Enzyme design. Structure first.
Site, short mmCIF file in Angstrom:
data_model
loop_
_atom_site.label_atom_id
_atom_site.label_comp_id
_atom_site.label_asym_id
_atom_site.label_seq_id
_atom_site.Cartn_x
_atom_site.Cartn_y
_atom_site.Cartn_z
CE1 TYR A 278 -4.41 15.45 4.67
CE2 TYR A 278 -2.85 17.24 4.49
CZ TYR A 278 -3.77 16.41 3.92
OH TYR A 278 -4.05 16.52 2.58
NE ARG B 104 -16.96 5.51 13.05
CZ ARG B 104 -17.64 5.57 11.92
NH1 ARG B 104 -17.47 6.59 11.10
NH2 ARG B 104 -18.50 4.61 11.60
CG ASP C 16 -14.79 0.53 14.72
OD1 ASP C 16 -13.60 0.55 15.06
OD2 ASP C 16 -15.18 0.90 13.59
CG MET D 212 -14.80 -5.53 15.59
SD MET D 212 -13.81 -5.38 14.12
CE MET D 212 -14.16 -7.01 13.52
CG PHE E 226 -15.60 -6.78 9.32
CD1 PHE E 226 -15.60 -6.77 7.93
CD2 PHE E 226 -16.41 -7.69 9.96
CE1 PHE E 226 -16.46 -7.57 7.22
CE2 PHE E 226 -17.26 -8.50 9.25
CZ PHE E 226 -17.29 -8.43 7.88
CG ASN F 230 1.27 18.85 4.23
OD1 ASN F 230 1.28 20.04 3.94
ND2 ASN F 230 0.62 17.95 3.52
CG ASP G 29 3.96 27.31 1.59
OD1 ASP G 29 3.52 26.17 1.84
OD2 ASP G 29 3.38 28.36 1.96
CG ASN H 68 -0.37 21.14 1.08
OD1 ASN H 68 -0.58 19.93 1.00
ND2 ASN H 68 0.38 21.67 2.03
CB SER I 237 -4.66 17.87 -0.96
OG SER I 237 -4.32 18.13 -2.30
CB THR J 284 -8.43 14.13 3.68
OG1 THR J 284 -7.46 14.24 2.64
CG2 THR J 284 -8.18 12.85 4.45
CB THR K 164 -4.32 10.99 -1.17
OG1 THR K 164 -3.12 10.26 -1.47
CG2 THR K 164 -5.50 10.20 -1.61
CB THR L 102 -1.24 14.77 -1.11
OG1 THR L 102 -2.38 15.43 -0.55
CG2 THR L 102 -0.13 14.76 -0.09
CB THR M 66 7.56 20.22 -2.80
OG1 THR M 66 6.20 20.47 -3.12
CG2 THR M 66 8.03 21.25 -1.80
CG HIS N 7 2.13 -4.69 -2.01
ND1 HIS N 7 2.14 -5.46 -0.86
CD2 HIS N 7 3.37 -4.15 -2.11
CE1 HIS N 7 3.35 -5.42 -0.33
NE2 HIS N 7 4.11 -4.63 -1.06
CD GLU O 164 -2.83 3.28 0.98
OE1 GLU O 164 -2.82 4.05 0.00
OE2 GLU O 164 -2.76 3.68 2.15
CE1 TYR P 182 6.67 -2.93 0.91
CE2 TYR P 182 4.93 -3.55 -0.62
CZ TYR P 182 5.95 -3.89 0.24
OH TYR P 182 6.28 -5.20 0.47
CB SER Q 33 16.43 7.16 8.68
OG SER Q 33 15.89 5.98 8.13
CB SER R 78 23.36 0.88 1.70
OG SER R 78 24.74 0.87 1.43
CB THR S 8 12.45 -4.47 4.16
OG1 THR S 8 11.65 -4.28 2.98
CG2 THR S 8 11.75 -3.82 5.32
CE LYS T 22 14.17 1.89 3.02
NZ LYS T 22 14.82 3.08 3.63
CG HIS U 118 1.35 -10.11 7.83
ND1 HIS U 118 2.68 -9.75 7.96
CD2 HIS U 118 0.94 -9.57 6.66
CE1 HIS U 118 3.05 -9.04 6.91
NE2 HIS U 118 2.01 -8.92 6.10
CG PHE U 119 -3.04 -6.72 8.04
CD1 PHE U 119 -3.83 -5.71 8.58
CD2 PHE U 119 -3.67 -7.85 7.57
CE1 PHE U 119 -5.18 -5.88 8.73
CE2 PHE U 119 -5.03 -8.02 7.73
CZ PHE U 119 -5.78 -7.04 8.30
CG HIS U 120 -3.88 -5.58 13.00
ND1 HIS U 120 -4.68 -6.49 12.34
CD2 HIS U 120 -4.61 -4.45 13.12
CE1 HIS U 120 -5.85 -5.93 12.09
NE2 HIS U 120 -5.83 -4.69 12.55
C1 HEO Z 1 2.11 -1.18 5.87
C2 HEO Z 1 1.82 -2.43 6.15
C3 HEO Z 1 2.40 -3.59 5.45
C4 HEO Z 1 3.80 -3.93 5.29
C5 HEO Z 1 5.04 -3.22 5.75
C6 HEO Z 1 3.71 -5.20 4.55
C7 HEO Z 1 4.95 -5.79 4.18
C8 HEO Z 1 4.89 -7.11 3.65
N1 HEO Z 1 3.59 -7.74 3.28
FE1 HEO Z 1 1.93 -7.70 4.45
N2 HEO Z 1 2.40 -5.76 4.13
C9 HEO Z 1 1.65 -4.67 4.81
C10 HEO Z 1 0.23 -4.56 4.80
C11 HEO Z 1 -0.47 -5.73 4.41
N3 HEO Z 1 0.21 -6.88 3.76
C12 HEO Z 1 -1.07 -7.62 3.66
C13 HEO Z 1 -1.15 -8.92 3.07
C14 HEO Z 1 0.09 -9.55 2.75
C15 HEO Z 1 0.03 -10.88 2.10
C16 HEO Z 1 -1.20 -11.66 1.73
C17 HEO Z 1 -1.42 -12.97 2.47
C18 HEO Z 1 -2.83 -13.39 2.18
O1 HEO Z 1 -3.58 -12.61 1.57
O2 HEO Z 1 -3.21 -14.51 2.57
C19 HEO Z 1 1.42 -11.20 1.87
C20 HEO Z 1 2.03 -12.43 1.25
C21 HEO Z 1 2.15 -10.06 2.43
C22 HEO Z 1 3.56 -10.11 2.31
C23 HEO Z 1 4.26 -8.99 2.84
C24 HEO Z 1 5.73 -9.07 2.79
C25 HEO Z 1 6.58 -10.21 2.31
C26 HEO Z 1 6.17 -7.81 3.35
C27 HEO Z 1 7.60 -7.40 3.51
O3 HEO Z 1 7.81 -6.11 2.92
C28 HEO Z 1 8.13 -7.40 4.93
C29 HEO Z 1 9.63 -7.14 4.86
C30 HEO Z 1 10.24 -7.05 6.24
C31 HEO Z 1 10.98 -8.03 6.76
C32 HEO Z 1 11.25 -9.29 6.00
C33 HEO Z 1 11.56 -7.87 8.15
C34 HEO Z 1 12.77 -6.95 8.12
C35 HEO Z 1 14.00 -7.74 7.74
C36 HEO Z 1 14.87 -8.27 8.62
C37 HEO Z 1 14.69 -8.08 10.09
C38 HEO Z 1 16.07 -9.05 8.14
C39 HEO Z 1 15.95 -9.47 6.68
C40 HEO Z 1 15.22 -10.79 6.59
C41 HEO Z 1 14.97 -11.40 5.42
C42 HEO Z 1 15.43 -10.80 4.13
C43 HEO Z 1 14.24 -12.71 5.41
N4 HEO Z 1 1.40 -8.87 2.90
C44 HEO Z 1 -2.36 -6.99 4.03
C45 HEO Z 1 -3.69 -7.70 3.89
C46 HEO Z 1 -4.94 -6.87 3.66
C47 HEO Z 1 -6.13 -7.78 3.62
O4 HEO Z 1 -5.94 -8.99 3.40
O5 HEO Z 1 -7.26 -7.30 3.83
C48 HEO Z 1 -1.94 -5.68 4.54
C49 HEO Z 1 -2.70 -4.50 5.12
C1 HEM Z 2 -4.70 -0.64 17.73
C2 HEM Z 2 -5.44 -1.73 17.89
C3 HEM Z 2 -6.26 -2.46 16.79
C4 HEM Z 2 -7.04 -3.49 17.06
C5 HEM Z 2 -7.26 -4.10 18.46
C6 HEM Z 2 -7.66 -3.94 15.85
C7 HEM Z 2 -8.54 -4.99 15.73
C8 HEM Z 2 -8.98 -5.53 14.56
C9 HEM Z 2 -9.83 -6.69 14.44
C10 HEM Z 2 -10.36 -7.47 15.66
C11 HEM Z 2 -10.02 -6.92 13.14
C12 HEM Z 2 -10.86 -8.02 12.46
C13 HEM Z 2 -10.23 -9.40 12.58
C14 HEM Z 2 -11.21 -10.39 12.03
O1 HEM Z 2 -11.83 -10.08 10.99
O2 HEM Z 2 -11.39 -11.47 12.64
C15 HEM Z 2 -9.32 -5.90 12.40
C16 HEM Z 2 -9.29 -5.79 11.03
C17 HEM Z 2 -8.63 -4.83 10.32
N1 HEM Z 2 -7.84 -3.83 10.85
FE1 HEM Z 2 -7.50 -3.50 12.82
N2 HEM Z 2 -7.21 -3.15 14.82
C18 HEM Z 2 -6.35 -2.22 15.36
C19 HEM Z 2 -5.71 -1.25 14.62
C20 HEM Z 2 -5.68 -1.14 13.25
C21 HEM Z 2 -4.94 -0.15 12.54
C22 HEM Z 2 -4.04 0.94 13.16
C23 HEM Z 2 -5.12 -0.33 11.24
C24 HEM Z 2 -4.46 0.60 10.21
C25 HEM Z 2 -4.42 0.41 8.90
C26 HEM Z 2 -6.04 -1.45 11.07
C27 HEM Z 2 -6.53 -1.99 9.90
C28 HEM Z 2 -7.36 -3.08 9.79
C29 HEM Z 2 -7.87 -3.65 8.57
C30 HEM Z 2 -7.57 -3.13 7.15
C31 HEM Z 2 -8.63 -4.69 8.88
C32 HEM Z 2 -9.39 -5.62 7.91
C33 HEM Z 2 -10.75 -5.03 7.61
C34 HEM Z 2 -11.70 -6.13 7.24
O3 HEM Z 2 -11.66 -7.19 7.91
O4 HEM Z 2 -12.51 -5.94 6.31
N3 HEM Z 2 -6.35 -1.92 12.33
N4 HEM Z 2 -8.69 -5.07 13.29
CU LIG Z 3 0.80 -6.96 -0.48
#
Ligand code: HEO
Ligand code: HEM
Ligand SMILES: [Cu+2]
Ligand SMILES: COC1=C(OC)C(=O)C(C/C=C(\C)CC/C=C(\C)CC/C=C(\C)CC/C=C(\C)CC/C=C(\C)CC/C=C(\C)CC/C=C(\C)CCC=C(C)C)=C(C)C1=O
Ligand SMILES: CCCCCCCCCCCCCCCCCC(=O)OC[C@H](COP(=O)(O)OCCN)OC(=O)CCCCCCCCCCCCCCCCC
Ligand SMILES: CCCCCCCCCCCCCCCCCC(=O)OC[C@H](COP(=O)(O)OCCN)OC(=O)CCCCCCCCCCCCCCCCC
Ligand SMILES: CCCCCCCCCCCCCCCCCC(=O)OC[C@H](COP(=O)(O)OCCN)OC(=O)CCCCCCCCCCCCCCCCC
Ligand SMILES: CCCCCCCCCCCCCCCCCC(=O)OC[C@H](COP(=O)(O)OCCN)OC(=O)CCCCCCCCCCCCCCCCC
Ligand SMILES: CCCCCCCCCCCCCCCCCC(=O)OC[C@H](COP(=O)(O)OCCN)OC(=O)CCCCCCCCCCCCCCCCC
Lengths: 184, 97, 659, 259
Positions: C61, C71, C75, C79, C103, C124, C135, C142, C145, C149, C201, C204, C211, C284, C286, C288, C299, C315, C359, C362, C419-421
């Site tokens: 995996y 790959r 790409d 961008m 993208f 795994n 196992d 397994n 699965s 992929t 998956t 999985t 298990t 969402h 996914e 988590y 941990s 806790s 979070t 944790k 944010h999500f990167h």
């Molecule tokens: C695995 C990745 C991952 C993780 C961990 C998270 C965790 C969170 N997501 Fe980010 N999400 C993730 C992956 C995405 N979320 C996204 C989009 C997204 C959007 C949409 C915004 C928009 O569409 O315009 C919101 C509002 C959030 C909220 C959050 C929040 C509140 C958490 C929280 O769980 C974070 C909690 C952690 C915190 C807060 C820090 C730790 C805490 C500390 C240090 C102390 C405690 C502090 C407080 C209690 C304030 N997620 C997208 C957009 C996809 C797309 O648009 O194409 C992706 C991929």
């Molecule tokens: C390691 C370096 C990485 C770089 C430099 C990178 C760069 C980028 C860029 C430039 C974009 C598009 C931003 C835009 O649309 O303007 C993007 C989108 C995205 N990336 Fe990454 N990426 C990285 C890794 C990852 C990884 C590890 C994930 C794992 C889940 C990921 C998931 C995504 C997703 C879901 C999108 C949105 C797809 C879309 O726009 O349709 N990226 N990334």
């Molecule tokens: Cu979300």
């Protein structure tokens, strides 16, 4: 061993029940989405669904007697009780095919009026599960005829018992939400 | 024996299917009494099929096989009621006001 | 041959595609040529491809995830190169037809074929070892699965050469992904990659749920389990309850494009807002699924390399159970701007910030795990410290996006992109490299190179910050996502810094390749002999390195948390049994490869409308399923001669190395 | 600091800057000590630091675990009261209280351009709007095609544009100027050129001379035959003015999907 697979299949049906609830949520949004075409009251024949409901109910008690016969050592009566619940499930599928053929020929297919898309995707996905369990039942019948009521065949009977009774549980939700609520 | 649980759960589900069907096919002078009893008999007959056919037990996998069903009922209720509530407000808006 | 396959589907007269086509064809033929040179075809079969061993399947995996990481990064470097050229007024390489596939493919590959197999492959390899199991619960399932992929990564990669990929974004929103605005095969490649890999998956998540619940060691209750097992248990719950949502939603898009139905169409009673509701109800949970076992990885590492027990076990456990329930009630935050009411937006805004509470519990429990320890600065401990800094910045950013009034100006910005990167590179990728460094001696028997593992950290850390802190600034300036051509010159000099930070991430990927080469080149000097290279606390380190293929001659009896740590402090766990008994192990099966080989034939024929081939492909998957049911030689017994040979070679390594 | 969201020109943008700032400052009371403890505990409690107290068996404190739960709970409690109040005040389709009789502008997203209708002026434009400063603007937004997002980043919020559907948005400009608007949801190959100008005039005399300028054009929009001629797929459109429009053209665009 045997109980681990039976528990593991129960977890799959809980994911399969979440799969059907998305089809039910899509139907509830799209039920009023008729594109100037037929509604539920113009389509649903309720004597036809009552016969379809009782065919799936008869196949549920017929599988229950097959599992009862498995808890004695009568291999022949497991086959005979499995032969009848294959007939009641094939009658259920043959009526859903007749229901869908009447709609498609008369211009009420899934490509018209996206209420009809949500109708065909919920009743059709249920009938694909009944067809899938009908194939599984015939494969199980030829395994018991060849090998007997072995420990692996006994686990496969109880796995299909979970699957077959679940499809009758889903159909209670189907004829209520689709047919009975649609023909009020 | 165990025929008696299959036979009672079959007799009960016969009654719990004929009565919701007879109300719609006759009319019963009230759409709201019909809708309540239809959803009531659907829930009751689902409970009959779990107890009598699927043999749902609180002590079957040391507590599991039952908590797995209760959890997914909550997920289904969150997904279905949540999506209906979201899409109702999205469709009440996006209208020519 | 039939269908829409026409030989004009192959992108001739397009050099940036044809060069990478020949780089995989000649790359694949060179890889094929090495296996026949060294005579390893009968070894890859019967030991790796057909293997029902969870240790073999977990490694494979991660190999797929690392190869797809290359790959999905190659790409993303295109961008950054295009956006730096589109600003300052150049229509360079990548036309919008070319760029919009990129993208979309970057999102699909990096979520489904990089982040998902790396998380699944870590569960795994490790989870049956932590619970004292020999196992997984369903070992053939397994193996099946894994190959589903592989079908997903085959179909995405052949879209590079045979057709084109989707141009809709990675979630393929309606009517743009409908048959009248996307009439080509690109969404069909997107549909059948996600469908066929998505049923893999799902199996999985079922396999690791049963298990953990049923295959545990005697005496190990649920609150004596390792925390990584608790995190894997809750992550697999989300797989069972959300990947069915993806299965229906893609199948309803499949009926729209193939049968002409009206689910998400504009005209005939269809509702395109229903898909966006449905695709984020999976969407969402996914994210988590990806972050929960990473919390379990960090941990175990923080407890091991602080030489201290994990602070607040109860806790930390109940914070994981809080997240796996709260993950299903927050999904409307991805479409705050769709036009729902203030009550609907404020409800899902409030409960999105509720999930930040467990979070933070944790995060602070790992901080007090190392509050009075002796912290050894391993490579894996460096990813743990760097995760806490990076995920806190990116988690804080998402809570800012969880306010709907703040999200009305930051939706689909580069602020969202950054944010999500920040929580995937910061959380998932850092956790996948930390668990790779941590469990490398258990998987292979030798330690990784410590010098090159730290250099890979320092390029993946603030090299990420040069890459994505400018995108925070660009999200405020008003730059939106998926922008390809004629970008504003005021967004230049900030897209230039983000392009330079991707070069530093490229050096961290290069440092990972050098770290893997030097470790294999020097594996006889860095051998793990006792099975416990660090001071490990869980039951995985009670075995040899690599484990004896049944994992345990005698299954251990557990009396406490950190079962191997309490054994060592009592002088036990290097105890030779006076006698052994035969171990019932499953057999390797060629099916699962055959079932997946018909599925990629079925998937390719559905994309190109070759209906006789899709019938043959679908009937092949069912007949192979039926003929596998008639098989009776599914198991065997390991003799005591093989067990005693493999244990006496472990119990003299213990004696000749001190213990 | 001067970057179109931290320096906004509308009341909705200015109220959202304070919402972003107060949310960011609230979360910093728990994120800054988390980062400081991540570095501070790593340095003070090294294995090579022989002076720090080592407690390998300490894994539970009630007072530590109380604060670890309480202080994230109390921050989210303050943040949820703020989230509830500001979502009911910054909601689009809530009219702004100014008693200035808002200008209604109907917005249709095409491939790949923005079509604007001024129904009380009998004027239609492509890729340019004008409105007076310090007057509310009621936007009625729809799509002729796939989903877009109507966004003027310096003036306030965004809203999705969907075919057969009518979203609403209210904005205002506190200063005169021209503000670049974009499409914030990806819509196809020509998505990068879906950029319009939004001119806030110094007064209503400059708005009256732009409406009078835009009805000196020979082009009209008097039927849906001329609409579908303009709704042909095109990229990077110039600013175009239409002098006559159909009196209920915006409802006709919605009614070609809902009927
Ligand atoms: C695995 C990745 C991952 C993780 C961990 C998270 C965790 C969170 N997501 Fe980010 N999400 C993730 C992956 C995405 N979320 C996204 C989009 C997204 C959007 C949409 C915004 C928009 O569409 O315009 C919101 C509002 C959030 C909220 C959050 C929040 C509140 C958490 C929280 O769980 C974070 C909690 C952690 C915190 C807060 C820090 C730790 C805490 C500390 C240090 C102390 C405690 C502090 C407080 C209690 C304030 N997620 C997208 C957009 C996809 C797309 O648009 O194409 C992706 C991929
Ligand atoms: C390691 C370096 C990485 C770089 C430099 C990178 C760069 C980028 C860029 C430039 C974009 C598009 C931003 C835009 O649309 O303007 C993007 C989108 C995205 N990336 Fe990454 N990426 C990285 C890794 C990852 C990884 C590890 C994930 C794992 C889940 C990921 C998931 C995504 C997703 C879901 C999108 C949105 C797809 C879309 O726009 O349709 N990226 N990334
Ligand atoms: Cu979300
Ligand atoms: C059409 O738009 C394009 C993409 O989007 C689909 C691309 O992903 C890409 C790919 C991006 C890169 C530059 C490729 C660089 C090469 C690498 C590391 C890929 C290595 C992958 C493999 C050997 C595994 C493939 C094997 C089989 C399934 C056969 C291109 C070129 C592209 O033009
Ligand atoms: C879109 C259509 C797609 C259709 C794809 C699938 C349907 C095709 C037909 C499938 C049915 C044939 C099943 C094979 C018969 C033999 C199975 C058997 O005897 O095994 C019993 C097995 C217990 O396990 P064990 O005893 O170890 O046996 C191992 C099997 N190799 O028990 C098992 O756990 C295995 C049997 C489980 C069968 C599961 C039923 C599948 C339901 C599919 C739903 C189809 C529609 C989905 C909708 C799409 C999304 C909207
Ligand atoms: C057909 C058209 C489409 C093609 C698409 C691609 C299909 C997907 C293929 C993916 C399958 C994964 C392959 C995994 C092979 C892993 C082999 C391996 O790691 O063996 C190393 C072996 C270890 O030796 P040992 O001493 O036993 O170590 C004990 C560890 N427990 O060391 C040895 O001593 C053995 C040395 C021989 C091993 C050489 C094999 C190289 C690895 C195979 C290719 C992997 C890279 C490319 C994968 C592409 C994935 C998309
Ligand atoms: C899943 C989400 C989507 C649902 C729709 C499509 C999928 C339907 C099929 C799902 C079947 C799930 C069954 C899960 C049962 C798990 C517990 C169990 O009973 O497992 C028993 C067995 C594992 O036994 P094990 O110990 O590993 O060794 C067996 C040796 N004979 O398990 C087995 O061997 C049986 C299961 C393995 C065979 C399944 C592979 C075929 C699936 C093909 C799908 C075709 C879909 C094509 C259409 C496109 C979809 C729209
Ligand atoms: C799961 C099982 C799926 C197996 C289906 C594969 C075989 C389908 C039978 C096709 C028979 C046939 O003659 O199809 C003709 C027709 C379209 O063909 P035609 O319009 O003549 O032009 C060619 C390309 N459009 O075909 C059609 O109208 C489309 C036929 C394929 C239907 C798509 C299946 C949907 C699966 C979604 C899962 C839910
Ligand atoms: C928890 C952590 C999980 C990690 C998951 C795995 C991810 C990385 C996969 C690589 C690790 C496997 C290699 C180590 C296994 C043991 C190798 C071994 O035993 O050596 C055999 C062989 C040479 O030895 P030989 O001369 O045949 O005889 C001596 C045997 N002791 O040695 C060899 O030369 C074997 C070569 C095997 C490597 C092929 C696998 C390909 C996968 C690489 C992914 C992409 C890497 C980037 C590109 C590399 C190419 C430039």
């Amino acid at each position: 061993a045997g109980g681990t697979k039976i528990f593991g299949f129960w977890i799959y049906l809980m994911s399969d029940c979440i799969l059907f609830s998305i089809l039910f949520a899509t139907y509830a949004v799209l039920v009023n989405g008729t594109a100037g075409g037929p509604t539920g009251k113009d389509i649903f024949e309720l004597p036809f669904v009552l016969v379809e409901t009782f065919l799936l109910l008869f196949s549920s008690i017929t599988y229950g007697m097959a599992a009862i016969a498995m808890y004695k050592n009568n291999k022949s009566q497991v086959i005979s009780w499995l032969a009848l619940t294959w007939l009641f499930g094939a009658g259920f599928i043959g009526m859903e095919i007749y229901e869908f053929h009447h709609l498609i020929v008369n211009g009420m297919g899934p490509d018209r009026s996206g209420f009809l898309s949500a109708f065909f995707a919920l009743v059709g996905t249920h009938g694909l599960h009944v067809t899938s369990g009908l194939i599984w039942m015939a494969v199980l019948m030829v395994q018991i005829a060849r090998r007997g009521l072995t420990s692996t065949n006994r686990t496969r009977i109880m796995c299909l018992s979970l699957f077959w009774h679940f499809l009758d549980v889903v159909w209670i939700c189907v004829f209520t939400v689709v047919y009975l609520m649609g023909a009020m | 024996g165990s025929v008696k649980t299959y036979m009672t759960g079959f007799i009960l589900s016969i009654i719990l299917t004929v009565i919701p069907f007879w109300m719609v096919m006759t009319g019963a002078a009230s759409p709201a009494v019909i809708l309540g009893t239809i959803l009531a008999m659907a829930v009751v007959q689902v409970l009959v099929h779990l107890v009598c056919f699927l043999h749902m037990n609180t002590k079957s996998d040391e507590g599991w096989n039952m908590t797995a069903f209760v959890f997914t009922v909550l997920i289904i209720a969150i997904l279905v009621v949540g999506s209906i509530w979201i899409m109702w407000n999205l469709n009440y808006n996006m209208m020519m006001h | 041959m039939f269908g829409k396959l026409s030989l004009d589907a192959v992108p001739f007269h397009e050099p940036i595609v044809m060069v990478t086509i020949a780089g995989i064809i000649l790359g694949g033929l060179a890889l094929v040529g090495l296996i026949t040179y060294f005579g390893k075809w009968t070894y890859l079969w019967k030991e790796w491809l057909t293997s029902v061993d969870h240790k073999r399947l977990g490694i494979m995996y991660i190999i797929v995830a690392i190869v797809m990481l290359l790959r999905g990064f190659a790409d993303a470097i295109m961008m950054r190169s295009q956006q730096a050229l589109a600003s300052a007024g150049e229509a360079g390489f990548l036309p919008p037809h070319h760029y919009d596939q990129i993208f979309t493919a970057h999102g699909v590959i990096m979520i489904f074929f990089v982040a998902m197999p790396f998380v699944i492959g870590l569960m795994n390899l490790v989870v049956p070892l932590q619970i004292g199991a020999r196992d997984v619960a369903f070992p053939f399932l397994n193996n099946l699965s894994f190959w589903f992929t592989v079908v997903g990564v085959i179909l995405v990669n052949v879209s590079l050469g045979v057709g084109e990929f989707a141009q809709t974004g990675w979630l393929a929103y309606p009517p743009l992904s409908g048959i009248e605005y996307s009439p080509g095969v690109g969404v069909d490649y997107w549909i059948w990659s996600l469908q066929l890999s998505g049923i893999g998956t799902t199996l999985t998540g079922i396999n690791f749920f049963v298990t953990i619940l049923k295959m545990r060691a005697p005496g190990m209750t649920m609150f004596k389990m390792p925390v990584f097992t608790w995190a894997s248990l809750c992550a697999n719950v989300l797989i069972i309850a959300s990947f069915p949502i993806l299965t229906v939603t893609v199948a309803l898009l499949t009926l729209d494009r193939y049968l002409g139905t009206h689910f998400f169409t504009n005209d005939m009673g269809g509702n395109m807002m229903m898909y966006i509701n449905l695709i984020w109800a999976w969407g969402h949970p996914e994210v988590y699924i990806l972050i929960l076992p990473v919390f379990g990885v960090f941990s175990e590492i923080a407890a091991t390399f602080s030489r201290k027990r994990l602070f607040g076990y109860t806790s930390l456990v109940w914070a994981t159970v809080c997240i796996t329930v709260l993950s299903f009630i927050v999904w409307l935050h991805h479409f705050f701007t769709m036009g729902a009411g203030a009550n609907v937006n404020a409800f899902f805004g409030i409960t999105t910030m509720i999930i930040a509470i467990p979070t933070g519990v944790k995060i602070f429990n790992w901080l007090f795990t190392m509050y009075q320890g002796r912290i050894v600065f391993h490579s894996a401990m460096l990813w743990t410290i760097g995760f806490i800094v990076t995920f806190s910045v990116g988690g804080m950013t998402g809570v800012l996006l969880a306010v709907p009034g703040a999200d009305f100006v930051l939706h689909n910005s580069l602020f969202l992109i950054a944010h999500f990167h920040n929580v995937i590179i910061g959380g998932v990728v850092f956790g996948c490299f930390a668990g790779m460094t941590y469990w490398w001696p258990k998987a292979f028997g030798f330690k990784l190179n410590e010098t090159w593992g730290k250099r890979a950290f320092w390029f993946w850390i603030i090299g990420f910050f040069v890459a994505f802190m400018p995108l925070y600034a660009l999200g405020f300036m008003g730059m939106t996502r998926r922008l390809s051509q004629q970008i504003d010159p005021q967004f230049h000099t900030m897209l230039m810094i983000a392009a330079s930070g991707a070069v530093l991430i490229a050096l961290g990927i290069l440092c990972l390749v050098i770290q893997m080469y030097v470790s294999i080149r020097d594996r006889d000097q860095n051998r793990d002999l006792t099975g416990d290279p660090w001071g490990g606390r869980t039951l995985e380190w009670a075995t040899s390195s690599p484990p004896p293929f049944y994992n345990f001659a005698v299954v251990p009896h557990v009396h406490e948390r950190d079962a191997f740590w309490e054994m060592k402090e009592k002088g036990e766990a290097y105890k030779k049994p006076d006698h052994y008994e035969e171990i019932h192990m499953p057999k390797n099966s060629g099916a699962g490869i055959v079932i997946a080989a018909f599925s990629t034939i079925f998937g390719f024929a559905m994309i190109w409308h070759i209906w006789w081939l899709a019938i043959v492909g679908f009937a092949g998957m069912i007949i192979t399923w039926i003929v596998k049911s008639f098989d009776e030689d599914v198991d065997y017994y390991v003799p005591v001669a093989e067990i005693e040979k493999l244990e006496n070679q472990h119990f003299d390594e213990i004696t000749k190395a001190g213990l | 600091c001067n970057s179109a969201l931290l320096d906004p020109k509308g009341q909705i943008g200015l109220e959202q800057r304070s919402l972003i700032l107060t949310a960011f400052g609230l979360m910093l009371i728990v994120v800054i000590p988390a980062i400081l403890m991540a570095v501070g505990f790593a340095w003070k409690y090294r294995a090579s630091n022989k002076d720090a107290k080592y407690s390998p068996n300490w894994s539970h404190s009630n007072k530590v675990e109380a604060v670890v739960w309480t202080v994230p709970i109390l921050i989210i409690i303050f943040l949820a009261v703020l989230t509830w109040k500001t979502t009911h005040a910054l909601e689009p389709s809530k009219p702004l209280a100014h008693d200035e009789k808002p200008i209604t502008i109907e917005v249709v997203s095409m491939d790949w351009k923005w079509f604007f209708i001024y129904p009380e002026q009998g004027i239609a434009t492509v890729n340019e709007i004008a409105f007076p400063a310090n007057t509310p603007v009621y936007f009625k937004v729809t799509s002729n095609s796939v989903m877009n997002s109507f966004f003027i980043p310096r003036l306030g919020s965004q809203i999705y544009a969907m075919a057969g559907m009518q979203t609403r948005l209210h904005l205002i400009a506190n200063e005169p100027g021209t503000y670049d608007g974009i499409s914030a949801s990806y819509s196809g190959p020509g998505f990068s050129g879906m950029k319009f100008k939004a001119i806030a005039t110094p007064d209503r005399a400059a708005f009256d001379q732009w409406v009078a300028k835009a009805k000196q054009s020979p082009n009209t929009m008097s039927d849906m035959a001329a609409f579908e001629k303009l709704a042909a797929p095109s990229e990077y459109n110039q600013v175009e003015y239409f002098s006559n429009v159909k009196p209920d053209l915006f409802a006709d665009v919605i009614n070609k999907f809902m009927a």
